């Protein structure tokens, strides 16, 4: 994406249509004394993006962003943004048909905001997903239109700001908080797990007694069958040895006594339970539930230690990786921007990378420890260098820098422009200078000035026996 | 019958009577000792109180060594001793004097030793206190109460005496009249008994009620136990009938033995004993079939416990009736003596004062032992007032009337006083003087006062005089 066209009309300052073209695809410098006229562009852009978290952008009503609060003839504000979408990779899914994204933001009296994406309405969730597809969040160093006021906070800073800058690419505190919340949730669910185990332990004796009763009934049935077989064998023997009508219809005192005892036991141990199939089905279902519960318990028990080990390993690996990469990058940038110098990241006093690291700088040939020994211009320069080295973690096809050059020097601005033209190739950079008289090596210097209120550039017995 | 009386006193090395001091003989009818203010009469009353063992509450205990002569000229002497003599005298109708024993009756001495030692000697022979006080009580002189002593202390106590014994030590007017009538140590004992025995009766009645509840539960269980026993008896009868039927059936195919032998007249009774009804009864018994030791079980133990509880309740009622009878026999003679002494004090106040009326009355009207007895006085030309809101004169008048009523109730041959009628009108002094002179003849009295009308009627004048810090007594008659 290359910003080569800008159309701003119907705003607090851009009341007339000003010809704004001839943009350089390598370096863009919009300078001049018209600070409000230049800031109105970023105001309109952030109003299109819906950002309302700035002391100069946040208003009580949406009518304030219109020309003279929409009470001086211009009762509506309509802007049109044309973003080049030749890069199909960075483009969102399902929107690669349009070669150029056209966003028409129109607001009228009343406070209603319009949404247009290539000629179609879109809710806030759709545009939020479209922004996330191009790496545009709310709590991230992205949304290049404005990064905040980190440059002023960068002055008189402890190692905490540097550690958070490193964690912006590291992102370890969020993981720690999420894992603490998950551990608390698991410790709370342990009570429900214990309740489930107690319920299963209370259910078990019922099925145990059911199995015992089923076994007793089976034993009684087997004894009754044995007694019946013995009685049938005795009747067959008596019939073969031999009033025969009763003997035909029916078909050793110890055997008779045993048969009577077995019959009495079967009569006294009936235990009628025709649902033995349902009982064994409930038993196997309980067994499956118990084995799945124990398998889940052991799974989470292993997962806890596995996640702990992975946390430690990833933490150490990312720590050494950043301590190498960002240190080398900062050293190279400090050597390229400031000639004959070298700044590095060193622990405070015999500390580790986990505790914190401070920046050791070199003014000429004199190693300086803290930033208090440096002038305000050098502090602003190192802040600009740090905010330029930080944006490489979240790359974007374009970038817009807004009023961070407080007291830069001439040769330092020349070196910055040379590094941007040489090292920062492939990125469309726009910069709005706060103080003039700098950046004399820019290929295109947009001299924006305030003018007309706008900006211009028997057989049985035998068988038995 | 004769009465005992004192003749003379002897002192040896007293605190105020140095050397041997022998008092003259006293009169048989009436005597009187007289001395100036602060002349040593306090020493005399202290010696009289020490003779009878009634130690005063002013000096500390075991300090009798002060009775020995302790002065500047004699800082240390040998020992102290006092001696009193007693003898018999007869009082006839006309004016005379008869004696049954010309020899002295008894001699009581009590010596003091500076190492805080004392001893009693009767008839110059050593003795203890119990034997001599029993001998004195047998002679009509009971040392249990200080009837012979009349002191302003009792006057000021009665003037502040509450109707009940509100103080832990000071006895009230009710207790005072209790000691008067002699039934003092009869009320607290029976009261403590009626308390403790009644509490025991209450707790044993609670135990008996618990036992009765247990017996009621046992009877509720027996209500079903008896039905179970009746069912068991019916089952036993049915089994006996079934055995008899089986024996008859076994005999026809040929209690228990008797029915078996009578089965197989025999054949007639076997074939005509309602065979169909017998089978029906057997079937009914078999259908009903498909306890005996309850009489010899805890049910009998529960009945025995209930009987024991009833006996305990009866014994509690009996001891309650006994306590009620014991407490009922008191108020009869209580009110009897109350009315008697009331009449005596009424007539005494009517004859002496000739105006007003003093009277003790119950604050209530029914229960004499409810709250207490108050004492009101109506002076002449006045109204009824309490004993606490009067002057000293009315107080001592009521006190002398009360002690005269007590003397008339219980006789006493000895009576001593010391400045009881001091600072009064001469009229009442003359009245009590002629009263003790004429109306009293069967006893001996000792009066100490400064009024003129006192010694004018005293038959025996015993004057004490203190010269050079040494006191001596001289006794003379009333000759003129």
């Amino acid at each position: 994406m290359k910003v080569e066209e800008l159309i701003i009309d119907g705003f607090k300052s851009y009341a007339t249509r000003t010809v704004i073209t001839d943009w350089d695809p390598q370096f863009n410098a919009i300078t001049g004394l018209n600070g409000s006229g230049k800031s109105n562009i970023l105001d309109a852009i952030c109003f299109v993006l819906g950002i309302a978290s700035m002391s100069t952008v946040r208003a009580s009503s949406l009518q304030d962003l219109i020309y003279k609060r929409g009470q001086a003839g211009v009762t509506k504000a309509s802007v049109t943004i044309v973003f080049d979408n030749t890069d199909k990779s960075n483009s969102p899914i399902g929107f690669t048909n349009s070669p150029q994204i056209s966003v028409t933001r129109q607001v009228v009296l009343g406070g209603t905001s319009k949404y247009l994406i290539n000629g179609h309405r879109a809710p806030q969730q759709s545009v939020l997903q479209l922004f996330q597809s191009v790496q545009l969040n709310i709590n991230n160093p992205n949304f290049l239109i404005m990064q905040g006021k980190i440059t002023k906070v960068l002055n008189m800073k402890p190692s905490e700001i540097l550690s958070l800058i490193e964690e912006a690419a590291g992102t370890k505190m969020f993981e720690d908080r999420r894992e603490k919340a998950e551990r608390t949730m698991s410790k709370k669910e342990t009570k429900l797990q214990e309740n489930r185990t107690l319920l299963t332990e209370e259910i078990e004796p019922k099925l145990e007694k059911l199995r015992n009763e089923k076994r007793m009934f089976l034993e009684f049935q087997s004894t009754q069958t044995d007694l019946e077989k013995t009685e049938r064998i005795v009747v067959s023997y008596e019939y073969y040895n031999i009033m025969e009508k009763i003997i035909e219809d029916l078909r050793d005192t110890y055997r008779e006594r045993s048969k009577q005892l077995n019959e009495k036991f079967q009569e006294l141990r009936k235990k009628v339970n025709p649902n033995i199939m349902n009982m064994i089905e409930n038993v196997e279902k309980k067994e499956a539930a118990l084995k799945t519960m124990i398998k889940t318990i052991e799974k989470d028990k292993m997962k806890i230690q596995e996640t702990i080990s992975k946390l430690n390993e990833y933490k150490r690996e990312t720590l050494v990786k950043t301590w190498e990469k960002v240190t080398l990058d900062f050293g190279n940038i400090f050597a390229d921007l400031l000639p004959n110098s070298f700044a590095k990241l060193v622990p405070c006093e015999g500390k580790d990378v986990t505790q914190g690291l401070e920046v050791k700088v070199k003014l000429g040939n004199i190693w300086k420890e803290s930033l208090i020994e440096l002038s305000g211009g050098q502090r602003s320069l190192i802040a600009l260098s740090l905010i330029m080295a930080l944006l490489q973690f979240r790359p974007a096809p374009m970038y817009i820098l807004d009023e961070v050059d407080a007291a830069l020097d001439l040769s330092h601005t020349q070196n910055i422009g040379h590094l941007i033209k040489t090292r920062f190739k492939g990125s469309q950079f726009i910069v709005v200078s706060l103080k003039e008289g700098m950046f004399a090596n820019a290929n295109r210097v947009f001299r924006t000035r305030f003018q007309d209120g706008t900006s211009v550039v028997x057989x049985x017995x035998x068988x038995x026996x | 019958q004769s009465r005992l009386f004192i003749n003379e006193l002897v002192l040896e090395n007293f605190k105020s009577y140095a050397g041997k001091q022998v008092v003259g003989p006293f009169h048989t009818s009436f005597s009187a000792v007289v001395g100036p203010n602060g002349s040593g009469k306090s020493n005399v009353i202290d010696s009289m109180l020490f003779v009878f063992g009634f130690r005063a509450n002013k000096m500390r205990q075991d300090r009798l060594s002060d009775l020995i002569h302790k002065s500047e000229a004699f800082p240390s002497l040998q020992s102290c001793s006092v001696a009193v003599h007693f003898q018999y005298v007869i009082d006839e109708s006309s004016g005379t004097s008869r004696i049954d024993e010309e020899k002295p009756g008894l001699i009581i001495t009590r010596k003091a030793f500076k190492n805080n030692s004392s001893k009693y000697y009767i008839n110059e022979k050593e003795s203890s206190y119990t034997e001599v006080t029993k001998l004195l009580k047998n002679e009509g002189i009971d040392l249990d109460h200080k009837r012979f002593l009349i002191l302003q202390g009792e006057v000021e106590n009665i003037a502040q005496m509450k109707p009940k014994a509100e103080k832990e030590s000071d006895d009230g007017l009710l207790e005072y009249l209790e000691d008067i009538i002699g039934t003092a140590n009869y009320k607290p004992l029976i009261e403590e008994r009626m308390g403790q025995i009644e509490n025991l009766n209450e707790v044993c009645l609670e135990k008996e009620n618990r036992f009765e509840i247990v017996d009621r539960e046992k009877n509720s269980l027996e209500s079903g136990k008896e039905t179970a026993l009746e069912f068991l008896e019916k089952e036993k009868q049915l089994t006996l009938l079934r055995s008899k039927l089986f024996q008859f059936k076994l005999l026809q195919s040929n209690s228990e033995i008797k029915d078996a032998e009578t089965s197989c007249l025999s054949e007639d009774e076997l074939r005509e004993l309602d065979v169909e009804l017998i089978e029906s009864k057997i079937n009914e018994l078999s259908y009903y079939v498909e306890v005996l030791e309850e009489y010899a079980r805890r049910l009998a133990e529960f009945k025995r416990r209930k009987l024991d509880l009833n006996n305990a309740v009866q014994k509690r009622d009996e001891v309650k009736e006994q306590l009620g009878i014991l407490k009922k026999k008191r108020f009869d003679e209580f009110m009897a003596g109350f009315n008697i002494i009331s009449m005596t004090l009424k007539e005494m106040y009517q004859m002496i004062t000739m105006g007003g009326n003093a009277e003790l009355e119950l604050v209530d009207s029914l229960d004499p032992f409810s709250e207490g007895v108050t004492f009101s006085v109506m002076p002449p030309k006045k109204s009824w007032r309490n004993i606490t809101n009067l002057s000293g004169g009315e107080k001592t008048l009521s006190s002398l009337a009360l002690v005269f009523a007590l003397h008339k109730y219980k006789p006493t041959p000895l009576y001593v006083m010391d400045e009881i009628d001091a600072a009064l009108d001469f009229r009442n002094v003359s009245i009590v003087a002629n009263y003790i002179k004429e109306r009293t003849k069967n006893a001996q009295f000792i009066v100490i006062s400064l009024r003129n009308n006192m010694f004018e009627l005293a038959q025996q004048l015993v004057g004490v005089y203190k010269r050079d810090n040494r006191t001596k007594s001289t006794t003379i008659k009333n000759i003129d």
Binding site: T112, P123, M173 | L362, V363, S365, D367, S383
Partner: protein
């Protein structure tokens, strides 16, 4: 997730102050500056969203979880910030039902203008009247001190927001719900709620008066008091913003009828509350002719109640309606019965002899109303005067009849006489007497004021008997220490007395010296000075016309000591001593003159001898007066002997001239030969000689008893019984003889004998039977005196109970034994245990059982025996 959230019912600042999962994590972490900024940003973003109007579920879940956390925070417990945030989020405006439910119920459980703002900004719900009604019903049935606050809520719904729909809905749901009397502290809270509603805004509760009729017939007293106060406040507001409504006038009429019907309720609290309401609504700006007429006619008959506070409230009602009586058209502040009577007579005479017709008929009906009001106030004064004869009612009711007497009425002198007879606490009576009797108009001068006060005291002091005047002078001496009567009034009364020798046509000539001797009883220096004023009048030529003036002047001169015995005073007195017989008078004059001569003199003995020598020189009235003066002389001689004796004893006496100095000469050999108007003085002296050394008693007791038991004259019998009662102090036992004359044919003799009997028992003293028999006798004053004596001695009862149970066998009294027993059983004996068993031990008649059930004369023993 509304149902799930209803059933279940740092790093966060980097995203809240600068996604569904992130919002859920923040809500879980949040469950005071951070919370303050969070609620502020939430409130303003919600306001912006509502201003600018698929996005609703997120904000719904956010507001639900924020309400839940606010609820748990307020239940777990800086407060001003959260209350301001609640006011901000509530003015922004299904789930709203549960929203308002969980916003009001925890707030009601927790429970100062901030809370009022919270409760005001939460009633914006539309169609949710059932929920708020249920919540307020639970508040009234559970909370007590919050109900009144709910009333204030109705206030902010009545006039501040001007939405009559919700107000009338709440009113109808409150008036239609069923109420129970078994609720504890519930009816009281509801009564307080309605009272506050009527006190702050009674206009909206008036439109539904046709529905509150069910609440007007409540059985309890709290709701009745509340509703009578409510209608009182309603009629007050209706008469104050007259607004002249006819339907509201009909409502006023019907509620006034309800109050008239409820004025006779069987409860003192509701009666006093209705009295307070009618007193607060009678002083409004209206005429109410028939209303005030019926109010007065129903209050004049209900003043004779039986309770205490209702009586004083009724007297306050009468005073309030009297101080603002509408009868002020013609000659206001004047209620003369004669004036209204003569006006009515003139009108009715001119009627029998058309605007003039209307004017005369309205004047006639006005005079009729005036005469009815005057007869009503007269009869109410009569009832209150005969019932007043509790100290609060005595001290509060004085102002009413004082103001009544302030207006000239025909019952002025009679009313003053009744007031004086009633008054015998003290500070109130003396101050109203100083304000009324000692009044001083500013129009007149000092001399005119003194003359007016003199005329007042003359006309109020010359119309009474001896006893009431004695009590009045006692009360005056008890209030004379402030020196109210100045020197000018004393001078003017002395001048009036000096000019009285000669507007006094015999009705004030005596009254002047009466009030003179009446005021001289307060100070001694008043009678010591100005002796010549009484010398030439009381003892001068005026002393020969009327003897009452002589007696009163002798009283005045005798009160000097609380001239060096050389003036003509004693000479003039001795000159008046001369016989003035042949007249019914001269008895008390000499009776007091002899005392005035003896108690203060140089030597009364020589004067007494001179008198008894010059008097005996002399048809039977002469000897009668001689015996009288001799007896009184010997009595005063004994008195002076006693007084000199106690004076010599109090000097700071041989005791032979007082007790023994009674057997002197001047015996009575001539006084007793006349016995064995004529014999009256004979009996008097024969009974008075009983104090002479007490020997006359033992000499002639049977003779005097015989001549007194057969005395036909009742006055002589009363003299005998009073002398016998007095002789009990000076001592012989003459019992069983004075109790025989307790029942005589004359009532005065009985009164005198019972008075002496009740007097001797107090100081100077069985046979207590007749004192209980005379309880049910005629001459109700006797029964009242007997009851007062029976109640005065209760300062034992078993003795008199036994005496009565023993004397009940007299067989003389009938149908009065139970009455006497109930009369003597008023004062118990504090035990109730001994007499019970004493009666169970011996009981014969059925009256014993019936009066044991009644009060006194165990239960198991009584049931067994009977």
């Amino acid at each position: 997730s509304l149902s799930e959230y209803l059933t279940k019912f740092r790093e966060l600042n980097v995203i809240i102050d600068q996604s569904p999962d992130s919002l859920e994590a923040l809500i879980d972490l949040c469950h005071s500056s951070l919370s303050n900024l969070s609620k502020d940003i939430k409130a303003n973003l919600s306001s912006n969203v509502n201003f600018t109007e698929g996005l609703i579920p997120q904000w719904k879940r956010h507001l639900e979880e924020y309400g839940y956390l606010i609820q748990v925070l307020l239940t777990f417990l800086q407060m001003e910030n959260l209350l301001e945030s609640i006011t901000k989020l509530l003015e922004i405006n299904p789930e709203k039902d549960l929203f308002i439910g969980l916003f009001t119920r925890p707030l009601f459980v927790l429970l100062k203008m901030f809370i009022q703002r919270i409760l005001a900004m939460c009633v914006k719900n539309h169609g949710q009247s059932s929920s708020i009604q249920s919540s307020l019903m639970t508040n009234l049935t559970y909370f007590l001190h919050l109900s009144v606050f709910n009333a204030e809520l109705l206030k902010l719904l009545n006039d501040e927001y001007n939405y009559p729909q919700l107000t009338e809905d709440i009113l109808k749901e409150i008036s239609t719900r069923v109420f129970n009397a078994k609720d504890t502290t519930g009816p009281k809270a509801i009564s307080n709620f309605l009272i506050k509603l009527s006190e702050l805004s009674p206009g909206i509760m008036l439109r539904q008066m046709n529905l509150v009729i069910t609440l007007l017939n409540n059985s309890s007293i709290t709701l009745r008091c509340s509703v009578v106060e409510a209608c009182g406040n309603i009629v007050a507001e209706l008469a104050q913003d007259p607004q002249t409504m006819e339907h509201y006038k009909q409502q006023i009429a019907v509620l006034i009828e309800l109050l008239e019907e409820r004025f006779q309720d069987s409860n003192p609290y509701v009666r006093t509350k209705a009295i307070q309401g009618c007193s607060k609504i009678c002083d409004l700006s209206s005429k109410f002719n028939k209303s005030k007429a019926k109010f007065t006619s129903l209050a004049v008959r209900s003043l004779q109640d039986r309770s205490s506070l209702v009586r004083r409230n009724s007297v306050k009602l009468l005073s309030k309606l009297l101080l603002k009586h509408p009868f002020k058209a013609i000659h206001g502040s004047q209620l003369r019965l004669s004036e209204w009577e003569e006006y009515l007579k003139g009108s009715e005479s001119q009627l029998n002899s058309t605007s003039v017709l209307m004017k005369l008929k309205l004047m006639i009906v006005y005079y009729k109303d005036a005469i009815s009001f005057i007869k009503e106030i007269h009869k109410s004064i009569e009832l209150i005067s005969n019932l007043l004869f509790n100290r609060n009612e005595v001290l509060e009711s004085m102002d009413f009849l004082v103001l009544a007497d302030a207006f000239d009425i025909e019952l002025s002198e009679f009313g003053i006489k009744k007031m004086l007879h009633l008054v015998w606490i003290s500070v109130h009576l003396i101050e109203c007497y100083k304000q009324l009797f000692l009044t001083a108009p500013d129009s007149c001068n000092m001399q005119e004021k003194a003359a007016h006060i003199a005329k007042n005291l003359i006309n109020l002091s010359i119309g009474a008997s001896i006893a009431d005047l004695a009590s009045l002078e006692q009360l005056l001496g008890m209030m004379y220490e402030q020196k109210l009567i100045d020197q000018h009034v004393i001078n003017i009364l002395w001048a009036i007395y000096n000019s009285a020798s000669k507007g006094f046509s015999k009705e004030q000539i005596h009254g002047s010296i009466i009030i003179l001797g009446m005021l001289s009883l307060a100070d001694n220096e008043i009678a010591l000075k100005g002796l010549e004023s009484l010398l030439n009048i009381g003892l001068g030529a005026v002393g020969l016309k009327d003897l009452t003036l002589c007696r009163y002047s002798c009283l005045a001169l005798e009160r000097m000591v609380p001239q060096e015995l050389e003036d003509v005073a004693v000479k003039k007195l001795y000159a008046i001593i001369i016989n003035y017989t042949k007249d019914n008078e001269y008895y008390p004059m000499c009776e007091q003159a002899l005392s005035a001569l003896f108690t203060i003199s140089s030597k009364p003995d020589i004067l007494a001898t001179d008198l008894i020598r010059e008097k005996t020189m002399m048809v039977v009235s002469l000897s009668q007066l001689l015996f009288i003066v001799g007896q009184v002389a010997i009595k005063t001689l004994v008195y002076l002997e006693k007084c000199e004796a106690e004076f010599k004893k109090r000097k700071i006496d041989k005791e032979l001239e007082m007790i023994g100095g009674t057997n002197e000469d001047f015996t009575d050999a001539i006084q007793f030969v006349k016995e064995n108007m004529l014999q009256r003085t004979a009996t008097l002296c024969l009974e008075k000689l009983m104090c002479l050394s007490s020997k006359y008693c033992e000499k002639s007791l049977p003779l005097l008893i015989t001549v007194m038991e057969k005395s036909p004259d009742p006055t002589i019998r009363s003299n005998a019984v009073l002398g016998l009662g007095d002789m009990a102090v000076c001592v012989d036992e003459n019992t069983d003889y004075l109790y025989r004359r307790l029942h005589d044919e004359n009532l005065m003799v009985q009164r005198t004998c019972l008075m002496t009997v009740t007097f001797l028992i107090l100081a100077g003293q069985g046979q207590l039977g007749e004192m209980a028999k005379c309880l049910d006798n005629p001459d109700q004053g006797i029964s009242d005196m007997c009851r007062l004596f029976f109640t005065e001695l209760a300062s034992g009862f078993i003795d008199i109970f036994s005496n009565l149970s023993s004397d009940d066998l007299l067989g003389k009294e009938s149908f009065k034994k139970i009455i006497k027993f109930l009369l003597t059983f008023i004062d118990k004996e504090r035990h109730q245990k001994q007499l019970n068993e004493k009666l169970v031990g011996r009981l014969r008649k059925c009256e014993t059982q019936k009066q044991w059930d009644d009060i006194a004369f165990x239960x198991x023993x009584x049931x067994x025996x009977x």
